Design a protein around this motif. Structure first.
Motif, short mmCIF file in Angstrom:
data_model
loop_
_atom_site.label_atom_id
_atom_site.label_comp_id
_atom_site.label_asym_id
_atom_site.label_seq_id
_atom_site.Cartn_x
_atom_site.Cartn_y
_atom_site.Cartn_z
N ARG A 49 0.82 -1.21 0.00
CA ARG A 49 0.00 0.00 0.00
C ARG A 49 0.85 1.26 0.00
O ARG A 49 0.48 2.27 -0.62
CB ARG A 49 -0.93 -0.01 1.21
CG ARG A 49 -1.92 1.14 1.27
CD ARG A 49 -2.69 1.11 2.58
NE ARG A 49 -3.37 -0.17 2.78
CZ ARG A 49 -3.92 -0.55 3.92
NH1 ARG A 49 -3.88 0.22 5.00
NH2 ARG A 49 -4.52 -1.73 3.99
N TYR B 130 1.75 2.43 -3.54
CA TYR B 130 0.70 3.21 -4.19
C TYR B 130 0.54 4.58 -3.54
O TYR B 130 0.21 5.55 -4.23
CB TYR B 130 -0.63 2.45 -4.15
CG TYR B 130 -0.55 1.03 -4.67
CD1 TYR B 130 -0.29 0.77 -6.00
CD2 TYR B 130 -0.77 -0.05 -3.82
CE1 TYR B 130 -0.22 -0.53 -6.48
CE2 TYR B 130 -0.71 -1.35 -4.28
CZ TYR B 130 -0.44 -1.58 -5.61
OH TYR B 130 -0.38 -2.88 -6.07
N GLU C 299 -6.11 9.72 1.95
CA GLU C 299 -5.64 8.92 0.82
C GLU C 299 -5.46 7.45 1.21
O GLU C 299 -5.56 6.57 0.35
CB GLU C 299 -4.33 9.49 0.27
CG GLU C 299 -3.11 9.24 1.14
CD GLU C 299 -1.87 9.93 0.60
OE1 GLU C 299 -1.99 10.70 -0.37
OE2 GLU C 299 -0.77 9.69 1.15
N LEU D 124 -7.23 4.73 -1.08
CA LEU D 124 -6.49 3.63 -1.67
C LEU D 124 -7.08 2.28 -1.28
O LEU D 124 -7.31 1.43 -2.14
CB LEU D 124 -5.02 3.72 -1.24
CG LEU D 124 -3.90 3.02 -2.01
CD1 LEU D 124 -2.59 3.58 -1.52
CD2 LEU D 124 -3.93 1.51 -1.84
N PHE E 146 -8.55 0.30 -4.53
CA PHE E 146 -7.58 -0.50 -5.26
C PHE E 146 -7.70 -1.99 -4.97
O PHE E 146 -7.66 -2.81 -5.90
CB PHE E 146 -6.15 -0.03 -4.95
CG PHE E 146 -5.78 1.26 -5.63
CD1 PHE E 146 -6.62 1.83 -6.58
CD2 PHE E 146 -4.58 1.89 -5.34
CE1 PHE E 146 -6.27 3.01 -7.20
CE2 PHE E 146 -4.23 3.07 -5.96
CZ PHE E 146 -5.08 3.63 -6.89
N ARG F 175 -5.42 -0.65 -10.51
CA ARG F 175 -4.20 -1.05 -9.82
C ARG F 175 -3.13 -1.50 -10.80
O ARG F 175 -1.95 -1.15 -10.65
CB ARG F 175 -4.50 -2.17 -8.83
CG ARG F 175 -3.29 -2.64 -8.04
CD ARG F 175 -3.43 -4.09 -7.61
NE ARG F 175 -4.61 -4.33 -6.80
CZ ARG F 175 -4.97 -5.51 -6.32
NH1 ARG F 175 -4.25 -6.60 -6.56
NH2 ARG F 175 -6.08 -5.61 -5.59
#
Ligand SMILES: [Mg+2]
Length: 853
Positions: free
Chosen positions: A453, A456, A471, A475, A479, A496
């Motif tokens: 994670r 990303y 965020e 996420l 994702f 993703r």
RNA sequence: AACCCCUACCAACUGGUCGGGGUUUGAAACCAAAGACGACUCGUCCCACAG
RNA sequence: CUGUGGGACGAGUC
């Protein structure tokens, strides 16, 4: 080959040149100890090659250590001085109290070891560890799993010990300085050797599997026509394939030597194009293979056979003899003449080529390769492709030069041999071969593994901004968890996959995340001037039109400046919101992927621009890192020579102590009392009768007693007399000695020490984003880097400076540009070496490629 | 081309011209890498979409 | 196990 082969070359034999540094005798004593200074000049060149490899290793190890520290992000240097020593095993590191006997019963040492173990545990628990996929992770099946803590600790401690060896230059620091890398076998424990062997064995097994999946082609002809057994033919073919080029072999074999043959009565291969139509391929390969096999067999039979002969009856193989012959030529036609009749002397394999014209596994593991090669391969896992290529190419070139010099030396008549402390270089040929083999696959493997994670998060931060911990949810809920609250998604993860393939899979983003914070890398990229400068540099390569067509495509004639401005506007203000609002287009597939392709191209251009900026900055910083490493090494050498220089106070007094020592008589003191002692200029003037050519014109005809003789000539004679006391040949010149003495009276030791510390720590790459919006014009990366460095120095010690340094700081603050005088003051520690002082302080000789301007 | 060295002319000689050299100067012999983005060919691996 | 696209790497030229 009777008592001399190529010993008449001026490079190998010649008068002693009395090198400028004057440390030739000290270097020979430290590395050889039994060589004659005034008899040869090859040992000093070997020592210079060793110094060059030390410099390049110091640069790349500093870069790798900074990358590891940035990835850790614990506000403390994980890799540095006094942390993660190689002398402690993993069992002792994890349990220092039970193994107190190894820590010489020191409570503070045990507490430090416990703190280091806690830091190592936190680093292992850090999700950012996945960026070093090839180092701390292994691929078992489909997913990547974390390696054992023992191997990770071994790698980290080995890198820390290498960093210690880079800047140790001491006599007792729980290790043997300057030779730890050259004596890894007798200094490393079994666990480190096992870890290096496993790291090498993974790649060797992968290569063996890949070759076996494609070995059915070469075995059809190579292993059949030549009669070579297939078991011991795969290694030979692999070595031939890796070393079939002029880069490694040293001479042309396929492009020139191969075509030099087939001109005799055996021209049926080329003339008869009917039968030799689809079989010329792999027949050229067979000819190249047999030539390479003959050359390597000759080299191997010459080696390990001259060991019995002590110094005189040693011979030199035709390998590298042809290279010496080629290097003696100074014309293209001379090279062709050298290849001619050399193709005839080598033509003792007539039976082999006659058999060839009738045509129509075990790999060296980590136990056989040297520990230095495995350590270098492990180090490459922390750098990126271009850095790996440059470091390995420099290493192989220097090791090849060392091997050639060590082979030439017995023929010259030099009996110099390495003492049993630097005997690592005695087998430089094997080291170079292993380094070439490692370089053959160092680029392979996925740089990033086990996408987490945080990866990303960094991808979003480098693209977008104006967000917070929100965020994290944005996420997690989009994702990987969108089907339900916490259930994994089906094959509907196109967003993703897009993010991974456009950010994570790119090596430029890996380089960025290894040296910079994604938010800061986004902040710096919003400057219009820097983006325009990068686009102009790209245009000057002789691409902007292609980028405009693939990003803002418009089939109409437009000016290059307009396209650059449009690309800059697209790059400036980059945000993740534009990709987030058009996720429907991203998840779709087919012919309507025009928007997706445009987004991919824009992301690639943005990453390329920021990667170019970061790479230029770090290269410029690494040059000064190398300069300071050279300064410290020369300080150590002068201390060993016998001169009065204090190494412990070198950092306190600044790295200009070498410059002061080489200048001559000390002057930077309130109680000089040297002008009266330097009154021998009058005696020198009185003794001008020795120079019978200047006396009739100096004080006989062109006297000019008014101003030239009294005010000017006396001062110049005083300056020359001060210059004749210099301890270095570079400063023996009056002009450079005067410049160095004038510069020494204005430098601040604190400023120079801070500049050196921040250059070693690569502090510019951290505040580059903060100190880039206050620049009027960006002419080159040199000015940008030095302006940022000066701004950092000011922010640190603006109020703690007085004199001309304060004036230079005020000029930098007012005139938003780097100061040349301040740059000279900071490069004063480099002043003992005139070329290094000029290159690192003048924006005309710094960059090799920018010399065209 | 920055620095060093050599022959000749001149020259405070801390300066110029004429040529030659420098792996023993500088990231610095040559090749190569980098600068330097991007395009094509031949082989390998990985990823995504389908049976 | 079989096909279509993208990325990375080994080899050479712009
Ligand atoms: Mg050198």
């Amino acid at each position: 080959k009777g008592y001399a082969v190529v010993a008449n070359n001026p490079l190998y034999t010649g008068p002693v040149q009395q090198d400028m540094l004057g440390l030739k005798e000290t270097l020979e004593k430290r590395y050889f100890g039994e060589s004659a200074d005034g008899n040869d000049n090859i040992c000093i060149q070997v020592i210079h090659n060793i110094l060059d490899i030390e410099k390049i290793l110091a640069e790349y190890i500093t870069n790798a250590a900074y990358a590891v520290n940035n990835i850790s992000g614990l506000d403390k240097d994980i890799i540095g001085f006094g942390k993660f020593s190689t002398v402690y095993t993993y069992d002792e590191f994890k349990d220092p109290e039970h193994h107190r006997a190894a820590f010489n019963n020191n409570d503070k040492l045990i507490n430090a070891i416990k703190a280091q173990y806690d830091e190592f545990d936190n680093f292992l628990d850090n999700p950012r560890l996945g960026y070093f996929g090839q180092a701390f992770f292994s691929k078992e099946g489909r997913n990547y799993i974390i390696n054992y803590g023992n191997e990770c600790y071994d790698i980290l401690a080995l890198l820390s010990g290498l960093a210690h060896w880079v800047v140790a230059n001491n006599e007792e620091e729980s290790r043997i300085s300057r030779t730890w890398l050259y004596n890894l076998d007798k200094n490393l424990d079994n666990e480190y050797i096992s870890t290096l062997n496993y790291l090498y064995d993974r790649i060797t097994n992968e290569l063996t599997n890949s070759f076996s999946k494609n070995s059915a082609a070469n075995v059809n002809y190579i292993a059949e026509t030549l009669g070579i057994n297939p078991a011991e033919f795969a290694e030979q073919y692999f070595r031939f394939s890796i070393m079939k080029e002029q880069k490694n072999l040293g001479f042309n074999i396929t492009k020139l030597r191969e075509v030099m043959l087939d001109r005799k009565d055996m021209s049926e291969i080329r003339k008869n194009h009917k039968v030799f139509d689809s079989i010329r391929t792999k027949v050229y390969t067979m000819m190249d293979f047999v030539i390479y096999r003959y050359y390597i067999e000759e080299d191997a039979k010459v080696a390990a056979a001259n060991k019995s002969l002590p110094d005189n009856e040693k011979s030199l193989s035709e390998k590298d003899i042809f290279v010496i012959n080629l290097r003696g030529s100074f014309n293209d036609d001379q090279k062709d003449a050298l290849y001619y009749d050399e193709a005839n002397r080598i033509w003792r394999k007539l039976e082999n080529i006659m058999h060839n014209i009738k045509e129509f596994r075990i790999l060296p593991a980590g136990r056989d390769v040297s520990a230095f090669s495995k350590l270098m391969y492990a180090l490459t896992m922390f750098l990126d492709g271009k850095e790996i290529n440059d470091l390995l190419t420099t290493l192989i070139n220097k090791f090849d030069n060392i091997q050639s010099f060590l082979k030439v030396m017995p023929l010259i008549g030099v009996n110099a041999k390495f003492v049993e402390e630097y005997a690592f270089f005695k087998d430089s040929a094997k080291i170079a071969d292993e380094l070439r083999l490692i370089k053959s696959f160092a680029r392979m493997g996925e740089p990033i593994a086990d996408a987490r994670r945080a990866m990303y998060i960094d991808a979003i931060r480098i693209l977008g901004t104006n967000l917070s911990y929100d965020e994290l949810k944005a996420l997690a809920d989009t994702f990987s968890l969108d089907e339900n609250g916490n259930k994994l998604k089906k094959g509907k993860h196109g967003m993703r996959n897009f993010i991974i393939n456009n950010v994570i899979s790119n090596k430029r983003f890996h380089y960025l995340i290894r040296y910079g914070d994604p938010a800061h890398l986004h902040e710096i990229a919003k400057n219009e001037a820097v983006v325009k400068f990068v686009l102009g540099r790209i245009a000057d390569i002789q691409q902007i039109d292609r980028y405009y067509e693939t990003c803002i495509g418009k089939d109409k004639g437009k000016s290059v400046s307009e396209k650059v401005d449009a690309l800059t506007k697209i790059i400036t203000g980059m945000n993740y919101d534009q990709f987030d609002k058009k996720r429907s287009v991203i998840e779709d597939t087919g012919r309507e992927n025009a928007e997706r392709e445009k987004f991919k191209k824009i992301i690639s251009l943005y990453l390329t621009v920021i990667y170019h900026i970061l790479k230029n900055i770090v290269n410029i910083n690494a040059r000064y890192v190398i300069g300071f490493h050279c300064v410290e090494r020369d300080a150590q050498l002068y201390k060993e020579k016998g001169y009065d220089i204090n190494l412990k106070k070198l950092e306190e007094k600044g790295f200009s102590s070498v410059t002061k020592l080489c200048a001559g008589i000390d002057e930077t003191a309130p109680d000089k009392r040297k002008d009266v002692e330097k009154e021998m200029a009058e005696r020198a003037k009185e003794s001008i009768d020795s120079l019978e050519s200047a006396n009739p014109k100096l004080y006989a005809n062109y006297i000019k007693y008014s101003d030239e003789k009294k005010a000017e000539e006396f001062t110049r004679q005083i300056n020359r007399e001060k210059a004749k006391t210099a301890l270095n040949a570079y400063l023996r010149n009056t002009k450079w000695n005067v410049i160095i003495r004038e510069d020494l009276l204005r430098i601040d030791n604190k400023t120079c020490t801070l500049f050196a510390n921040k250059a070693v720590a690569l502090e510019v790459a951290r505040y580059v984003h903060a100190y880039i919006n206050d620049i009027a014009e960006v002419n080159s990366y040199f000015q940008l880097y030095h302006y940022i460095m000066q701004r950092i120095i000011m922010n640190e010690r603006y109020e703690k400076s007085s004199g001309k340094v304060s004036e230079y700081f005020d000029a930098v603050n007012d005139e938003k540009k780097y100061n040349d005088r301040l740059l000279k003051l900071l490069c004063v520690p480099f002043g003992y070496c005139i070329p290094r002082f000029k290159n690192l302080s003048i924006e005309a000789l710094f960059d090799r490629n920018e010399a065209a301007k």
